[PDB]
Structure 1
């Protein structure tokens, strides 16, 4: 497929970053279709780490033009901060990076509000990244949200910002009894970056249309995972954006029909950060062990991630929703040393029902229970193997099973953070 997609099945942290990079060695474009600066896609080339939040994981490549579609929330401060850091490391960001005229803007109050709201909820605290994502998406749909294109006329801009800010401030000081977020500073801060920003602007809709008719390999890169989807996730303990493969055409501008392959990244175990239902969770040794064995802390907020076994019931929702074509199995090595690995084949509802289908909203997960299928483990190390035959039959079997339990082929295995600690049995871009 010319148009290959790569997104996350679980609750994010599957390892999209490494995968986009590693895969883009033929990519003309690379697009972020949704999200804000809440992701933390990590790359490790020949031994050197890189932690990309808002900047597409195709940035570390000359040939690839990295873009950020209309479906993205953009924090000016955020962008520039990532820019500097990437620049000082030799990456010509300003040259490679492209960006949407339509991307709504994330200013400081969007953080202010996010901050305030998460407080009011007290106990029922979702677990937001503190990056103002929600409020920007909000204002966006409200039709008061400022977008990149508004910067194309500093005159009227500060006029709108004046109103928008006043409004958001009335509730900051009167409702939440908080502190007014100062307009002027917002403006000063925003004006000292406009020209740099507005310089990379483009009509990404027509771009994709063009590339397509030429036949340019294009790869979309998703932030977060399906179960966190605004519409189809464990609401409301989810993200404010359609992290599903339908976000592509809505977030980029490209027509739905031109998607040629959706690659679902699948972490060999489960992890969740932020509050919400996590059926297969663990609080025993294996729980902490998985947290340790795979360095499980939120690559943006540092929050220690929760562990559990690969929930196959959950995966299957993803499989249908995102129309997978194959699976990218990441983190196998974390399972090394276990005496036994077990996955979840079905749910036992709180009323006695056994089922292989999932509950929607958060409430509906209230008493669900994991029904496993324990398989042997392995003391052998699968770390860095790049050939199937370097995987012991046990682990080999764990793969065979997951293909069956899903009907989706695991076209890629990954034995490490480093781009070369990967095994490719089926390349998205050519089949």
Structure 2
């Protein structure tokens, strides 16, 4: 059934984790594969007051009745993998987690995240694979296999990528980008699925774009201003203070076009307008809020099917009728 690919249209941290979590529970997909680079991104989600952060395992772990797979095109770090298996032991992920036996491994000599150096040898065919380490075996499998199997069985499959279009290796702010393409097409290749097998493509966006480290930020705002509006965010893995800037409709439109976005997702709308916090019904949104949304759909050319009005799961407006 309608396979959904979730990717970011900015510079990562758009809240891809929250969206995947919502869909995992509301839609109840049978498979939740993870794509992208590796563990250099910690997708977070707030489950009833408790904040979570995963870098290896998909952000759909809350859905016990579903397998969590990791695409072959994704780098795996044994240290973080097992760490999260313990952190999520309450969800019994260790029983439904599968790592493609063709995934590249991130060794300490790479970490010297290590995703960059890892891919360096990856394309140089010098790094080992998942089936080369003993610790990783009871989880090995063929993600491309299971995904296609369920896909033919009309089963729902949800895949999530990492980073954002802005960090794309091809269409990103080179050289200030990741070590690979993060478009919906790439994510599909990471899990082993044909482009014609993809039904829906959701490009996530957040009221205020953010950056991590050097890089061109046209809509960037003085951090002094980011403090007044209260948009100060810290990396879930580095604790680094991300740079903030106002929405970039131009980029949003472009990033949504190349990704062939069939749906748009907006998050942290409450940060743009306090009067929108908790809203579940679009019609119950304040003028200012509706203005922003409508403006996005007209500037991007794609309708927003999901709107996050808070960090909690219930804080979201689902209009995918």
TM-score class, shorter: over 0.9
1:45 to 44, 47, 54: 47
Q: Compared with structure 1, are the counterparts of its residues 283 and 63 closer, same or farther at alpha carbon in structure 2 (3 Å cutoff)? A: same
What aligned pairs does 1:335-346 form with structure 2 within 5 A after superposition?
335-336=272-273
**1:183-332 correspondence runs (5 A):** 194-195=134-135, 197-283=136-222, 285-290=224-229, 293-332=230-269
Change in CA separation of 1:280 and 1:65 when aligned onto 2, cut-off 3 Å = same
Show the counterpart of 2:85.
Answer: 83
- How many angstroms apart in 2 are the aligned matches of 1:284 and 1:49? 25
| 8 A contact 1:270–1:309 mirrored in 2 | yes
Q: Secondary structure at the match of 1:209?
A: helix
The aligned residue for residue 134 of structure 1 is: 116
* Counterpart-to-counterpart distance in 2, 1:134 and 1:284: 28
Aligned 8 A contact 1:7 1:263 in 2: yes
The answer for the alignment partner of 2:128 in structure 1 is 146
Gaps of 5+ in 2: none
The 3-state SS of whatever aligns with 2:184 is: coil
Deviation, 1:143, is 0.7
CA distance in 1, matches of 2:193, 2:235: 31
Structure 1: distance between partners of 2:263 and 2:190:
23
CA contact (8 A) 1:99 1:204 kept: yes
Between the aligned partners of 2:102 and 2:6, the Cα distance in structure 1 is: 23
Cα displacement string for residues 324-370 of structure 1 (whole angstroms, at most 9, x for unaligned residues): 0111111111123xxxxxxxxxxxxxxxxxxxxxxxxxxxxxxxxxx
Residue aligning to 1:71 = 73
Structure 1: distance between partners of 2:231 and 2:285: 19
Q: Post-superposition shift, 1:246?
A: 1.4
Cα-Cα RMSD: 1.4
Distance 1:413 1:78, change over 3 A: same
Mapped to 1, the partners of 2:244 and 2:148 lie a distance apart of 41
Q: Secondary structure at the match of 1:198?
A: coil
Q: Which residue of 1 is the match for residue 105 of structure 2?
A: 105
2:150 & 2:128 partners in 1: Cα distance? 29
| Counterpart residue number, 1:29 | 31
| TM-score normalised per structure 2 | 0.96
CA distance in 2, matches of 1:213, 1:83: 29
**Aligned partners of 1:226 and 1:232 also within 8 Å:** yes
CA deviation after TM superposition for structure 1 residue 313, in Å? 1.1
8 Å CA contact 1:58–1:65 kept in 2: the answer is no
Equivalent residue pairs, number: 319
Deviations along 1:6-57, one digit per CA (max 9) or x if unpaired, are: 1111101110111101101220001112221111111112222211111101
Corresponding position of 2:278: 384
Contact kept, 8 Å, 1:288 with 1:307, in 2: the verdict is no
Asked if 2 retains the 8 angstrom alpha-carbon contact of 1:415 and 1:422, the reply is yes
Q: CA deviation at 1:268?
A: 1.0
**C-alpha distance in 2 between matches for 1:94 and 1:223:** 22
Name the CA shift for 1:47/1:139 in 2 (closer, same or farther; >3 Å): same
Contact 1:312 1:405 survives alignment (8 Å): yes
After TM superposition, give the deviation of residue 289 of structure 1 in Å: 3.0
**Which residue of structure 2 aligns with residue 409 of structure 1?**
303
Query: Partner of 1:30: helix, strand, or coil?
Result: strand
Note the C-alpha offset of 1:286: 2.9
Cα distance in 2 for partners of 1:295, 1:284 equals 8
Distance 2:222 2:232 in 1: 16
- CA offsets, 1:227-273, max 9 Å, x none? 10112211111110221111123211111111101011110121111
Distance 1:35 1:64 in 2: 23
**Shift, 1:284, TM fit:** 5.8
Q: How many angstroms apart in 1 are the aligned matches of 2:44 and 2:270?
A: 17
Q: 2:313 aligns with which of 402, 405, 419?
A: 419
